[PDB]
Structures are given as structure tokens and as C-alpha cells.
Design a protein around this nucleic acid. Structure first.
Ligand SMILES: [Mg+2]
Ligand SMILES: [Mg+2]
Ligand SMILES: [Mg+2]
Ligand SMILES: [Mg+2]
Ligand SMILES: [Mg+2]
Ligand SMILES: [Mg+2]
Ligand SMILES: [Mg+2]
Ligand SMILES: [Mg+2]
Ligand SMILES: [Mg+2]
Ligand SMILES: [Mg+2]
Ligand SMILES: [Mg+2]
Ligand SMILES: [Mg+2]
Ligand SMILES: [Mg+2]
Ligand SMILES: [Mg+2]
Ligand SMILES: [Mg+2]
Ligand SMILES: [Mg+2]
Ligand SMILES: [Mg+2]
Ligand SMILES: [Mg+2]
Ligand SMILES: [Mg+2]
Ligand SMILES: [Mg+2]
Ligand SMILES: [Mg+2]
Ligand SMILES: [Mg+2]
Ligand SMILES: [Mg+2]
Length: 212
RNA sequence: GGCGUAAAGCGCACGCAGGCGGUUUGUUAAGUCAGAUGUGAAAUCCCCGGGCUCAACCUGGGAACUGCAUCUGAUACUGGCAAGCUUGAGUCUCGUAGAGGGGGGUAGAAUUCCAGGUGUAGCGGUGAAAUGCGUAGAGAUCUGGAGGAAUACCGGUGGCGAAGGCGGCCCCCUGGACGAAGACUGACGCUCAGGUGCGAAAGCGUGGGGAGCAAACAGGAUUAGAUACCCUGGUAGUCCACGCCGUAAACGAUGUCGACUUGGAGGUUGUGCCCUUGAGGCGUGGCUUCCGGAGCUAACGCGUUAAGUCGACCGCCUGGGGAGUACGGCCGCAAGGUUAAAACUCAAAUGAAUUGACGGGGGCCCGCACAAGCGGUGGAGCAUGUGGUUUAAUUCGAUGCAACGCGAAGAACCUUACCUGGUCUUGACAUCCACGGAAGUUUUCAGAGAUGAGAAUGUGCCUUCGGGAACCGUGAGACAGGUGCUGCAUGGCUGUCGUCAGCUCGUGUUGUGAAAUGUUGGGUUAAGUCCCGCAACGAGCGCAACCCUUAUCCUUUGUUGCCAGCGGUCCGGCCGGGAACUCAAAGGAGACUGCCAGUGAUAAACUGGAGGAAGGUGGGGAUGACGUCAAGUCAUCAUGGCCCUUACGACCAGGGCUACACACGUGCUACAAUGGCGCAUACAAAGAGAAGCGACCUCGCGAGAGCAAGCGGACCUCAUAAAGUGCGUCGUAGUCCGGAUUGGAGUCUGCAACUCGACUCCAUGAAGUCGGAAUCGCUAGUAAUCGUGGAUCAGAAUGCCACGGUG
RNA sequence: AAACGACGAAAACUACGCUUUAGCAGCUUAAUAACCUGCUUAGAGCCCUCUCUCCCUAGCCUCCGCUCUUAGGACGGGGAUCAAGAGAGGUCAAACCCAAAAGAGAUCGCGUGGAAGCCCUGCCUGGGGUUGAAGCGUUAAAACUUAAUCAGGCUAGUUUGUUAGUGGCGUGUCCGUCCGCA
């Protein structure tokens, strides 16, 4: 192991949590079990939709999952029927009634999860990894990101020996703890194994710490 | 085309034939140049046309047949002839330097022997030793004598010589080179296949010489072996004269001569003139060294002494091995030399340079890596894991540093895969289904249970009622399943170098090009941290900072946390009350080389100090680059093929992971008078608690048992911390030391501790009595020594992870 | 052993889409350009949707649950549809935001005085205690009140001990003179 996960090293400084609630470990295990279940159900359901992230709040005898996505229209549906359809299942899985929020994410090519997504789809549909990564990094640089670093490893191009390629633009200060280093992972299930993809997006230096 | 380095300059010099040849005139016109004639067969090629329906094919003419012979001219060049000239070349006259060669003499240093004197137990030698020399007087010292070789300093990138080569001094003969001025000789000039001559050392023959050195050889020594490197002796040889071979990295790996083509710093040796006041200056020659411009080269490098552009000549090269080998001719007393192949094999063999890596290469620097400690490990039981052993299994993985108190943060069945026994074939675990009943709640037997039967039963909520949740049973089919394998297909995660300080990119520049600068060099540092200088200018990953804890102060708000001041007391924070404090957890100030001197390059930076709780990162943690190790996990999980579907899949009972001769690793108890023992007695922090922590009373010698209040926790518990401190007691002891083994009977948790936890009593009292080679961590609240909490956990730490006491 | 790597010259997820300008930025000797561009300002022609502009109604609730209930509200239902238009969006359900009260005391819940069991006590007569067991009423009332009865046929006379006529397997199989439990 070389690099630690850049999210949980600055979660207490500049980055927000993906789950906001409290427990006295009387129900902590079941709360995360419920959070894991709802997260995996949402990920399995909203496959076509480009879901950016899933934040969960758990107030007293209620929950609130605020999904952030790039294209919210598919999840919304006509007259807001699909959200009502997929809200009851979440509510009954979590026990307490739910209230699902949906947030559109501006600049869909500047989110770590979004940029890590659909590159696996390109690999599945047999798009060359080098050109795919180059297009992703150049689009992210053009949109406004100050630094982008993309790594792709494992059975690239259906070869015989796996390797690890990477591209980098601008600056990616992974060691500093006063910058947005939003990072997410994704995997592709090709015809000759599994390919791992990692993306680091440095946007700026957040002075002052948490709460802006 | 090339010959400095890949293959290619004879080792050098002379020189015959031959090749070439300064300058002017006249003559000849042989080559050469112009024109004409004959011939150069036909055929063929080419060009223009035609015929075969096109083409192939045939055909007419033209051109061509690049050649030869003859005739008529041209005269610049080459050639022949005759006259001239000095600029090429050679000679005279005078000086200059020189280890140039041959021959003969002379003088010391030094080594070795002979003889003598003084003198006693060592000398010599090696990383260390011995062979060797010594009491028969060694080594050392002094005297005289014998003999051989070379001539310390001068002595240099100095001189001479064609090359080889040449070093005291003197004499005799002689070759060669340069310069000042002077006249003639008049092309007499350069090279050279054959040929001749010289030719390092080693080698051979004859006749001598032989001090030192030294092949062969003898002995000692290291090493597994050492026919060597090392040591002690030692023959040929090295020396002289005449003879023989003609080999070298005979090297400047560069064949001889001519002229042309920028410069600087010298060395040696002449010569002209200037006031020669110093090895003062201005010119001109000969030899030679270093740097370097243009130019050349694949590059290194050459660079007026070209490896720059030419001219004349000779020799050599045509892939690496076979091989400069055999045969053959010649030379030679011989060794051998010279001229010099062929068959067969190979896809390369090569040289200059570039980036890494290595060196028993050099320079500089850092880290408990050594040095100065301290304590332990290895010695003897005790708790663990690994290897092998045995078994049916001792389930599998990790197998150097980076595996061995590892996954496992804790195996009686559970976990659990392995084995012995029994059962199932859509399954324990999903989706699609046709039905019959909601389920479900007690229960009887067989059985170790898995599951085989049997019952009293429930008759749950839902529309038009062939119903739906939902539950089970039967029949399959896809399917489910694998801790089966492939981490040499992988994703993800992790260890190591290493918290070392380096790793790269953009532009520019340099070299054709791999590539280099930037990144090196000088200070400086914890550091690619900074500065300076420099074809470098900037940036990214990086070394730091931002992040967490703690070290001081201020403020905000005082309960469950505190008592500066007062009142009472049940003397206790008890509570009224007091919000300064100890403290609680939020925001700030605060240490930033900031300043003062010295040092340094007028910097960077370093040393000391007035201040501060703090000083150069104040003290710790997190943060672990490019990348290396087919590094470890397909048994956390996912994933591509491969494997089984009556079995590698599914369920249950009992055993095994904890095991008979051992070794290894990491820890604990210790060894004793620094100590254990009996009775009083203070000083902490951090954490846990809801079928859990568990106050008090009573039985208990005891683990604990009935009773249990309080506590989702600054309230109540876990939980009078130990070391120490007070007093006795033990006197260096098979010990009042170590509690390992073993027997008896129990206490708590767990359907159930025989295989296999721990605590408690009684007794028994193994070793040991400071540990061999070789080793491990630590530089300050650190190493040692003492106790406690917490993780998974029904119970199980001597392990792991953190607080503290002393230090 | 082994290990190379050439074409979004398949702009390929489709944001309604397509426009001009306004300025930053890459492009550069230098100011335009092609755009490489993410926005910001403007108009919507338009493919689209929603409140709609139709009428009737006063549809308007909200504190106390409900009952004509008051200040006030941004407050409010049915029906087929459009010519043009006033605003929001682009496959927008909530959230962020903006708000709730004067009522009056009509009622199920909610609280009732002579009643079904449980206390020596197991069957039970047990009122002695009590409710939604019987009269009764609003955010409140006509209030009001779940254990302590002794003792009885009460395991029923042969069950406990004086005690035997046989309606008895007795004793590996036992026919079994006799022993042995009632
Ligand atoms: Mg050639
Ligand atoms: Mg050569
Ligand atoms: Mg060579
Ligand atoms: Mg030569
Ligand atoms: Mg020769
Ligand atoms: Mg002629
Ligand atoms: Mg002619
Ligand atoms: Mg024709
Ligand atoms: Mg002809
Ligand atoms: Mg002539
Ligand atoms: Mg002479
Ligand atoms: Mg010759
Ligand atoms: Mg000789
Ligand atoms: Mg000798
Ligand atoms: Mg010798
Ligand atoms: Mg001789
Ligand atoms: Mg030779
Ligand atoms: Mg040579
Ligand atoms: Mg010559
Ligand atoms: Mg010379
Ligand atoms: Mg040079
Ligand atoms: Mg030969
Ligand atoms: Mg060595």
C-alpha cells in the first residue's frame, strides 16, 4: 500500500460526511446496515441515471436521503411519479418513513464519482482506455478543475499481462489537508477480468477549514 | 571506398627497373584536337512508315556498330630533340649544440666474498609464520684484499639518431643537423615492385667472465586443491669478442616529399639591431609540448609537426572463426621466420558515445549502524507460532531483512474447511412455477442428531368469491453451490526500500543521433530548504506548512466539576451560598531567526543571549512520490477462463487443529537480602456499562453465593492502584529464594471444560544460583521497573492496543 | 521462460436545440480570426409542460377533538375547451421558505354505589375492596373509595392403623403342597 484514501484524511477538516446522524450504539449497527441497504438498492436501481453521491440524515423516527445526481430528470419522471414510486421501498426497507431529496449537480464532468463513472461503460462497450482517459482529463481541465489525475489498472486493452497507466494535468496536492481532493473509485467488468479506475480532482484551496 | 581506434601504413633506411617531374625559347608532331577516305558483313538494338483484322511477327529507309588504318592540317598541353635560368636539389667558407656511433683508459658510491680485530644470542623474513643463516661465534662494527655490472644529484613531455636506441669522466677516428653573409653546378628532383643493409629484447654456436638480479628447480607458507601471487636459496640468462634468427603494442596503432589554410602559452638551440642598468625589447630561422578557431571524422578526437583542401609513388584491406593454420618454395645448426590457402559453421563479429547497475576504485554526507553506555535474548521449567515426526485429520494461507505472540481483536458443539460415521438430489441459501392448506402453538416415539412418522390444534386480514399478502409440503427445469485451483490473468487492500530525498514534465539550448542542461558547482540544512554562480527559464509529484494531541495566558457558560470569603453544624463540601480558582470545551493571543552582538561572500545560514512556558520543526502523531520485490492475499469481497452437478455441492453426531524421541522465533516468571514475608498508609490518568457494570448486609480461610439500590452514565459502579512508604522478621543458606510438576476436594460462565479456560484452599517444592560463540532496542520524561483500563468475548493474554507512578 | 504498446481520421452520456453582444482565457512577437472554451447580459421564432385568463359557487379554515362559531388569510371545488396572453420551468413529488389565532361547552373516550370472581380456603355462600356490574355527565361533573371474614361436606369414614372372603402376575418356563404384597 502506498496511498491512503484522501477522503477520510480530511473528512474532519474540509470534506463533508456522507451520513449525518447520532447513535449510542444501541442502534448504530442497524443504522449502518439500513444505510448500506438503501445505498446498494439505490445504486442497483438508478443504473442509467448518473448518481453523483448519496448523503443520509437520520432524525428521530425518520430518515432523509439527499441523492445528488447529474441528470435528475430520469429519476424524477413525469409529474414526479418515479420518486414517489421508489420512495415507499426505501421507507419500508429503513422502517421509518422516508423523504427523498434530489439535487442536480452542476458541471457533471467535475465530480469525482461522475468522472469515475461511464468510463467503465466505455470499457464495456470497447472504447480505448487511453483516449477515454485523455478525453475525461481534458474535459475536466477545460471545465475549470485546477488538477486532474486518472489511473487505470488491470488487463488494459485485453492484453496478457495487467499494468497500471495514469495521466495527470495541473496540480494534485494529495498531501495538503486544505484543499478539495474529492476522490471516488469504479470498476469495469470486461470480457477478460476487471479493470480498476481511480480519479483525483483538485478544485481549489479552501481557506478557513470547514463551514467555508 | 578506406587504412589512429571496425579489416587495412611494410619496424626503418638505401636503391635498380618503373611511375611522375621546376621555368623560357626554337624545333618534331608521337599521344592528344579538327576534316576527308576505306572498312567496321548480313543479322540485332533505336527512330520514322508499311503489311499481317490489333499485337507478337515480318519488312523499307535512316541512325548506330562507341573500333582500326591512311591522308590533309591545328600546336595550347604531355612526349622527343637543342639551347637557356635559379626558386627545387647538392657543394664550399665560419661557428653552434647534442646520452649520435666505434675503440682504448681512468675515479668513487654501492652489493657480494676472502683474511684479521672488537663484540654476544640472535639475524633474516611476512598480514602472521616457517624453510634459511646462528654458540663451528651469526647479524653489527673497523681495517686490508679479490671480482662483476651500472655510473646517485645534475635529469627535464630536455638533446641526438631513419628506426631500434643512446646517461660518470678523458682520449683517438667518424656520421648527421642548424644559422649570419658570400659565388657556381644548373633539374642533377620525389617515390619505389624485386634487391641490399640496419634492426629492442628473448634465443642458439664457439672461447671467456660471472658481484647483484633472475626463468627451470629445491624448501617454507595461504588455500578444499595453488605445478602461482609471498618468503629462503638457486642453473641457463643478464656481461665480453666473433658468429646465427629477424621477431614486438618495432605505437604517434598516423608510409616519404612539395606548397597553400585563423591564434595563444611555452621548451631547446643560433642569428641582426637597439643606452644589454636584471633571464631589457623589437625580428628572423631549426626541433618539440600544451590549448584551441575554421575545416574533417560515426564519435573520441586531429587541428600549420592536421586525421583541413590537393599533387607524385609504394604497401595493405573486402564478415567473425577455421588461421596468419596445413601443404608447398625459400632462409635458418635449431627454435622458428617468410609466401600463403581450402573444406565446414554462424547470424553476426565490431569501435566511439549515451542511461542505468557493479568495483575487494576515489571523494563527501545521513540513520542507535558502529564507538561510550543501560537492560535483556542464547542458560531451566513456564505461554505461543513454524519445520519435521505420528495419526484419519493435525484444515488452509504467510516461508529472508519485509514469515514465525502472523490472518486468528481470543477453536468443547458453534467458529470449522479435515477425518470417521450416517442422510439429500432444483437442494442449506434466490427468481419462474401447478396445486392442497395462512401461519403458528404445545407436544408421543425411533434416533447420536440430521429426519421418519404420529395428535390437540390456528381455522389470521383482504373486491363480484377460478382472489392476494404470506407461510409451508410435493414434481421437475433452467439454476443454486465450492474456504477447488489459477495473486505467473486481475480489481481492491497491504508490507519493503523510506518519512530516504529524490522522481519528472513544458519551453529553450547543446550533440545528426541514444541523450545532456535544468537536477551539477560554493556555502547551508532535518532535507531538490535557501542563496550565489552558471543555457537556462518555470512547473508537478516531492520536504515544510495547513491537520490531531500537549506545553502559557485571556474571554465567553458553572452541573454531575471547585471551595478565595461568610453561617451553622451530624466536622463531613454537609448545603445555603460564592462563579477567582483545580477543572470542563469553544474562540483567540502566543515561537515567527522576531531582535542584540560575533561569524560569512555587503547574502543564504550559523554561534552565543534581553525577553518568554517556551529557540530554531518547542515535544509527539497522522500524512509514505516516481517506482523495485511475477512481494502477500482468487480462504474478507468481486472478477476472466478450468473443474462437479447422484457431488469438490447440502444436513447432523464424535474427534483434530492444543499431538509421544527435537530444533527455531518472539514474550513472562525469575537468579534473590535493591529482595518475598506479616500488620497500618498516600499519590494518577485514560476507558466500559442495559437481558451490562454491578453498590451495601450476611455466609464465607476462596474463587463467590442470597439480598440487591444506583447507573444509557462528570452523579453509580468496574476500581482502598502498585513501586514506595512505617515497623519488626528472614543473614547468604535444598534459603521465609523460584511456584514449574503432581494428589485431594470446589467456586463462577457455558445444553456440555476427559481430550480442551480460568480463578480458590491444603500439600508437594523441577530447575536455577547471572548464561559460550553470536547478538537485540533505546540519546530524555526516552531504556529499565510497577500497576490499570480497553478491543473481539458465555469464559479464556504471559499477546495486542493506550494511559499513568517512579525514573 | 516471457512482457509490448500507431488513428473519438468509430468527437459517440445527450443537457430543449439553435442565435448576437457583452468580458475573462488557451491561441501570440504583437492586436483579430478558427474558436479550446465554462459562464455572464439580451430576444424567444419554436418544437413542450404547468397556474391559468369559461362559467357557477362563495367554494375560504382554525383554534378544543367535532357543533352556525371570530380578527384574518398568501385562503378555497366541479365540469368540454381555447384565439391570443400574464409568469414558472424543461421527464421537478415534497425541502429552503410564509402564518396562525376570539369561539361557545353540544359528545364517544374519559370519571359513576349495594355487586361477578379472588383473602383459613382446592370445589365455593362469601357482599367485608372494587370498575365501563345498575341511575349518571364535558376537556369537565351530580365528588368519593379492587382486601383483611372466622368456621363448614371439604384427598372422604374401610384412603391412616385394629382387620380377610378371594373378583390376583407372584417366584429363567414354571403344573407347582408353601412362602407375600391388600
Ligand atoms: Mg569502405
Ligand atoms: Mg585495427
Ligand atoms: Mg581491435
Ligand atoms: Mg610505421
Ligand atoms: Mg620487416
Ligand atoms: Mg601527331
Ligand atoms: Mg581523328
Ligand atoms: Mg499496322
Ligand atoms: Mg551490322
Ligand atoms: Mg615539348
Ligand atoms: Mg661531428
Ligand atoms: Mg622491399
Ligand atoms: Mg640479447
Ligand atoms: Mg635471488
Ligand atoms: Mg625469487
Ligand atoms: Mg651466450
Ligand atoms: Mg610484424
Ligand atoms: Mg604498426
Ligand atoms: Mg626512400
Ligand atoms: Mg629529432
Ligand atoms: Mg587541440
Ligand atoms: Mg607459420
Ligand atoms: Mg573486501
Amino acid at each position: 500500500g502506498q496511498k491512503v484514501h484522501p477522503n477520510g484524511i480530511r473528512l474532519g477538516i474540509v470534506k463533508p460526511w456522507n451520513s449525518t446522524w447520532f447513535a449510542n450504539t444501541k442502534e448504530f449497527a442497524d443504522n449502518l446496515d439500513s444505510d448500506f441497504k438503501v445505498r446498494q438498492y439505490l445504486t442497483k436501481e438508478l443504473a442509467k441515471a448518473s448518481v453523483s453521491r448519496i448523503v443520509i440524515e437520520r432524525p428521530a423516527k425518520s430518515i432523509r436521503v439527499t441523492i445528488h445526481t447529474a441528470r435528475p430528470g430520469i429519476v424524477i419522471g413525469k409529474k414526479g411519479e418515479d420518486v414517489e414510486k421508489l420512495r415507499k421501498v426505501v421507507a419500508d426497507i429503513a422502517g421509518v418513513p422516508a423523504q427523498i431529496n434530489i439535487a442536480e449537480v452542476r458541471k457533471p464532468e467535475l465530480d469525482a464519482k461522475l468522472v469515475a463513472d461511464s468510463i467503465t461503460s466505455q470499457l464495456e462497450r470497447r472504447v480505448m482506455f487511453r483516449r477515454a482517459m485523455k478525453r475525461a482529463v481534458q474535459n475536466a481541465m477545460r471545465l475549470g478543475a485546477k488538477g486532474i489525475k486518472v489511473e487505470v489498472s488491470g488487463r488494459l486493452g485485453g492484453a496478457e499481462i495487467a499494468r497500471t497507466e495514469w495521466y495527470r494535468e495541473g496540480r494534485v496536492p494529495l498531501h495538503t489537508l486544505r484543499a478539495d481532493i474529492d476522490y471516488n473509485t469504479s470498476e469495469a467488468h470486461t470480457t477478460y477480468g476487471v479493470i480498476g479506475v481511480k480519479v483525483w480532482i483538485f478544485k481549489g484551496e479552501i481557506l478557513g477549514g470547514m463551514a467555508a
